[PDB]
From Swiss-Prot, chain A:
Name of the protein this chain belongs to: Small ribosomal subunit protein uS15c
Binding partners and assembly: Component of the chloroplast small ribosomal subunit (SSU). Mature 70S chloroplast ribosomes of higher plants consist of a small (30S) and a large (50S) subunit. The 30S small subunit contains 1 molecule of ribosomal RNA (16S rRNA) and 24 different proteins. The 50S large subunit contains 3 rRNA molecules (23S, 5S and 4.5S rRNA) and 33 different proteins.
Species annotation: Spinacia oleracea
This protein's UniProt keywords: Chloroplast, Plastid, Ribonucleoprotein, Ribosomal protein
This protein's GO CC annotations: chloroplast; ribonucleoprotein complex; ribosome
Compartments where found: Plastid, Chloroplast
Molecular functions per Gene Ontology: structural constituent of ribosome
Role of this protein: Component of the chloroplast ribosome (chloro-ribosome), a dedicated translation machinery responsible for the synthesis of chloroplast genome-encoded proteins, including proteins of the transcription and translation machinery and components of the photosynthetic apparatus.
GO annotation, biological process: translation
Protein family (similarity comment): Belongs to the universal ribosomal protein uS15 family.
Swiss-Prot record, chain B:
Subunit structure: Component of the chloroplast small ribosomal subunit (SSU). Mature 70S chloroplast ribosomes of higher plants consist of a small (30S) and a large (50S) subunit. The 30S small subunit contains 1 molecule of ribosomal RNA (16S rRNA) and 24 different proteins. The 50S large subunit contains 3 rRNA molecules (23S, 5S and 4.5S rRNA) and 33 different proteins.
Cell location: Plastid, Chloroplast
Family note: Belongs to the chloroplast-specific ribosomal protein cS23 family.
Protein name (database record): Small ribosomal subunit protein cS23
Gene transcribed to yield this protein: PSRP3
Role played: Component of the chloroplast ribosome (chloro-ribosome), a dedicated translation machinery responsible for the synthesis of chloroplast genome-encoded proteins, including proteins of the transcription and translation machinery and components of the photosynthetic apparatus.
The species this protein was found in: Spinacia oleracea
Top-level lineage group: Eukaryota
Swiss-Prot record, chain C:
The protein's name: Small ribosomal subunit protein bS6c epsilon
Superkingdom, taxonomy of origin: Eukaryota
From Swiss-Prot, chain F:
Entry protein name: Small ribosomal subunit protein bS18c
Note: Two forms, which differ in pI, are produced, S18 alpha and S18 beta.
Origin: domain of life: Eukaryota
First-listed, main subcellular location of the protein, grouped into a coarse class: plastid
Family: Belongs to the bacterial ribosomal protein bS18 family.
Keywords: Chloroplast, Plastid, Ribonucleoprotein, Ribosomal protein, RNA-binding, rRNA-binding
Function: Component of the chloroplast ribosome (chloro-ribosome), a dedicated translation machinery responsible for the synthesis of chloroplast genome-encoded proteins, including proteins of the transcription and translation machinery and components of the photosynthetic apparatus.
Plastid among keywords: yes
Subcellular location: Plastid, Chloroplast
Gene from which the chain derives: RPS18
GO terms classed as biological process: translation
Length: 62, 84, 111, 134, 247, 64
RNA sequence: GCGGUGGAAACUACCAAGCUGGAGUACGGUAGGGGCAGAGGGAAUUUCCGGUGGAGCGGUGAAAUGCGUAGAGAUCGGAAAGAACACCAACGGCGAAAGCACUCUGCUGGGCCGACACUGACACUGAGAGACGAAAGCUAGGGGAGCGAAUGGGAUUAGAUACCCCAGUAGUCCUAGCCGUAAACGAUGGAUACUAGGCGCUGUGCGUAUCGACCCGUGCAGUGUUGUAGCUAACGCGUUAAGUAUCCC
């Protein structure tokens, strides 16, 4: 299941970001946010590598 | 849990205290450790060995320590005097 | 009987020691601030049972409201096996620091 | 399952018999099957057996020995890769080497299949030299 | 809402300096009219709530002030503390719980608390620690006094039945608001001060001669002859209420 | 030994105080002969009971 | 060498379609000084305030400067202050490294293990780039007990800007930044696959044994110590290679 990985990582970045911006100095979870961004980004380049229209739907969903 | 023997020896210069210890619910073999002629601590060495065991109950550790203490005590008095 | 409700929120247990003098408004008023916790928490709040007063090791420094007087050797050992949301535990800490008959209140989180 | 499936088999051969163990377990892909097919028939090894463990067909391969010696195999096997991934090598039917005069062979990928120097020198075809053993 | 009919209007004219007309508080004059704000220091309405609707800039102060209403029909201004959420409710009284913004007498409260507006005796409006960040703490209380560490590094046992507005008073960032326009000193009604070396011997005791004159006297003095370093200007027997100067 | 099934809490002052000395200080794993997990868990529990003044921080020295 | 043209399809690439052991996710557990924030703690030290008592205390290789009849130090009580957190502490656990240990709470990272529960190669490395980055340093504001560059005095010394001693400022701590270096060391870039063992530790999993804690073997992951092969100039390293190979900087 791929779109649950992208969507799940998106909610991960939402909850972790609204953690981090009202907190502002945790330099440990910064790596977690950046590993999630990079991991999701290699997924988006993967599904963009496979398809057009379907990845256009992944952009249009979020 | 078997039960226990300190053996002391007094010769004028030198104490030895020798702690022979015994088994808990876990089958173990102690020696008798003999603590030695130089001024290096006998009670601390003995008691610490017992505490390191936990295999020794408090009553057991204490009774042997009391006997050990008594001999070190007699030894100190004889060394300060000449008893022999 | 306790694993019924912890779908949804958390579980704690607060240890709080008391004055040794008073016998009245001690089971009463601290259960009334436990009802203040009931306005806050509202979950399976049971087993708020009391432990007998015994001599502790060493304690000073009551800090009454402008008293700063009493040394102690004894104290009533309350412990609340309560159950709440993880939100609003710091107001339980302020409630169990500021009040007079509660000194040295350490909460915990049993698993 | 690393980068190479041929340094897979080959490094399992070198690491197999440099510790004198006469038994190899490797994956059985198409080109591994072809190499052990053109390698059992050339006297280097003894037997290759396919089987399965979790329905994954593998090759266990029995190496050669001799009798009770200081080391029970005298001639050290000396396997070597040539066409590394990222540096492909290619030869005509001129360059195709007689290894040590012929005591080694150079297994290589023709358009026919994969041959040796005997079976690609008579053909006159050339191709990508996988590796040569000696 | 300006022109509140609480700005109270008539004053003594600007930043005045005239006793009989003689310059007696020096370097004053200039600036705007600076109409004052009659604010409510001594809260004479206890145990009735009141919201906060406006943080107005008082030009008389270093801090801001705020307009507070009531459940009854009144309007006052008080010093808002740090943390004045707009719409938040303040209430004076004797048993009102401690919140950043409300007032209570100095007895019914714990020790070790941030309070700005305290009273030195009963009946007065408001004396101590009311600047733009002036915060006074409480050391423990006594029978009819209360040792209070006010923002000078100075402690003072005080009458315990004095009103006090608990909170740290806001607008702290005037520690760093630079006056770098270099004529903005004159906008506050503060004329430039001349220096004692460059005056004449009829004016200042350090009226010199040729060149940048060294200070000449055994001590650097005021323009009226008293030594201006270390000489404590305090009557020897006034109150004896302060514990230690701690300065 | 002495695990006794129920987990070690500050409320269990039976197996606790078999682990401190009469001088009131925590004994190591090789003396008490437990696992690492038992040792750390009684460590945190003993220091909790140290907060509640159930246990002394120092016991006054004695002879005779 | 380049070009034209006719053939081959194993390998790279390409086109299409499946596959799962690579990689992830979902789930259930699990361990942790991972990080940050908030509360709370008690020894000890210093200073102050009291009661006692009266001549030294402190220090050293030996002395001295210092402090002390204005009552020192010592002892008991009372406060306050900051900083660090004894035993536990282990050849231990975690982090990517730097680092991380008084306890508790909150938010949150990461790891490990199982079932096929899902997708189907999504993988590795990474120029330039970006982040973090011990200590000392600097800007701004707090705070300042101990320790303590500079400094000052005493001593040793031919001399002493030094080792010793007595005072002692910046600094040490915290907030917000800058700085971006260290023997930042495992003196060992990362990743995958394969190649004896013995003795260990940590985390989980299965079976035995009891039916419950053990206890034995093990499946893995991580950490350590001797060590075969092989490598090495040697010392040594040796499944966590400095071995055999492949890739990337």
């Amino acid at each position: 299941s791929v779109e649950f990985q992208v969507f799940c990582f998106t909610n991960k970045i939402r909850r972790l970001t609204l953690h981090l911006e009202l907190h502002k100095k945790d330099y440990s979870s910064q790596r977690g946010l950046r590993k999630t961004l990079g991991k999701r980004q290699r997924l988006l380049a993967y599904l963009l590598k496979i398809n057009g229209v379907r990845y256009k739907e992944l952009i249009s969903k979020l | 849990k078997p039960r226990l023997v300190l053996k002391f020896i007094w010769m004028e210069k030198n104490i030895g205290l020798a702690l022979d210890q015994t088994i808990p619910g876990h089958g173990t073999v102690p020696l008798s450790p003999y603590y030695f002629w130089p001024r290096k601590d006998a009670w601390e060495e003995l008691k610490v060995l017992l505490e390191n065991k936990p295999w020794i109950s408090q009553k057991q550790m204490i009774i042997l320590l009391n006997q050990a203490t008594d001999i070190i005590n007699l030894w100190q008095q004889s060394g300060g005097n000449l008893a022999s | 009987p306790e694993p019924q409700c912890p779908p949804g929120l958390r579980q704690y247990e607060t240890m709080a020691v008391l004055r040794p003098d008073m016998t009245e408004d001690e089971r009463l008023t601290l259960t009334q601030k436990y009802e203040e916790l009931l306005v806050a928490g509202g979950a399976m709040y049971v087993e708020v049972f009391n432990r007998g007063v015994i001599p502790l090791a060493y304690s000073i420094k009551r800090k009454n409201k402008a008293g700063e007087t009493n040394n102690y050797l004894d104290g009533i050992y309350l412990l609340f096996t309560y159950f709440t949301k993880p939100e609003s535990i710091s107001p339980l800490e302020a409630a169990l620091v500021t009040d007079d008959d509660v000194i040295r209140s350490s909460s915990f989180k049993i698993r | 399952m690393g980068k190479d499936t041929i340094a897979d088999i080959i490094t399992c051969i070198r690491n197999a018999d440099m510790n004198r163990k006469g038994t190899v377990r490797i994956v059985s892909t198409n080109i591994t099957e072809n190499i052990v097919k053109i390698l059992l028939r050339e006297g280097f090894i003894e037997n290759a057996r396919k089987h399965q463990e979790r329905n994954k067909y593998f090759l266990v391969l029995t190496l050669r020995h001799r009798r009770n010696k200081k080391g029970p195999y005298l001639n050290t096997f000396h396997l070597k890769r040539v066409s590394r991934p990222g540096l492909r090598i290619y030869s005509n039917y001129q360059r195709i080497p007689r290894i040590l005069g012929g005591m080694g062979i150079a297994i290589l990928s023709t358009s026919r299949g994969i041959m040796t120097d005997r079976e690609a020198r008579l053909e006159g075809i050339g191709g990508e030299i996988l590796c040569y053993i000696w | 809402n300006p022109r509140n009919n609480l700005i109270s209007g008539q004053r003594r004219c600007g930043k005045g300096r005239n006793a009989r007309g003689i310059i007696t508080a020096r370097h004053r004059g200039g600036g705007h009219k600076r109409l004052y704000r009659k604010i409510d220091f001594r809260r004479n309405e206890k145990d009735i709530y009141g919201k906060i609707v406006t943080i107005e800039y008082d030009p008389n102060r270093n801090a801001y002030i705020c307009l507070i209403h009531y459940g009854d029909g009144e309007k006052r201004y008080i010093l808002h503390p740090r943390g004045a959420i707009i719409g938040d409710t303040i209430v004076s009284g004797t048993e009102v719980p401690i919140k950043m913004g409300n007032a209570l007498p100095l007895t019914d409260m714990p020790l070790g608390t941030a309070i700005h507006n305290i009273e030195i005796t009963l009946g007065r409006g408001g004396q101590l620690a009311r600047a733009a960040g002036a915060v006074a703490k409480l050391i423990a209380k006594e029978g009819k006094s209360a040792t209070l560490k006010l923002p000078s590094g100075e402690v003072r046992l005080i009458s315990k039945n004095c009103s006090a507005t608990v909170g740290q008073v806001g607008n702290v960032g005037v520690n760093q608001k630079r006056l770098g326009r270099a004529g903005s000193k004159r906008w506050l009604g503060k004329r430039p001060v001349v220096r004692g070396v460059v005056m004449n011997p009829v004016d200042h005791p350090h009226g010199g001669g040729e060149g940048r004159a060294p200070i000449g006297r055994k001590s650097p003095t005021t323009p009226w002859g008293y030594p201006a370093l270390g000489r404590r200007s305090r009557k020897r027997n006034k109150y004896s209420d302060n514990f230690i100067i701690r300065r | 030994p002495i695990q006794s099934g129920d987990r070690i809490d500050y409320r269990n002052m039976s197996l606790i105080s078999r682990f401190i000395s009469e001088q009131g200080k925590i004994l190591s794993r090789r003396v008490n002969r437990l696992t690492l997990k038992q040792q750390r868990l009684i460590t945190s529990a003993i220091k909790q009971a140290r907060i509640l003044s159930l246990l002394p921080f120092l016991n006054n020295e004695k002879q005779f």
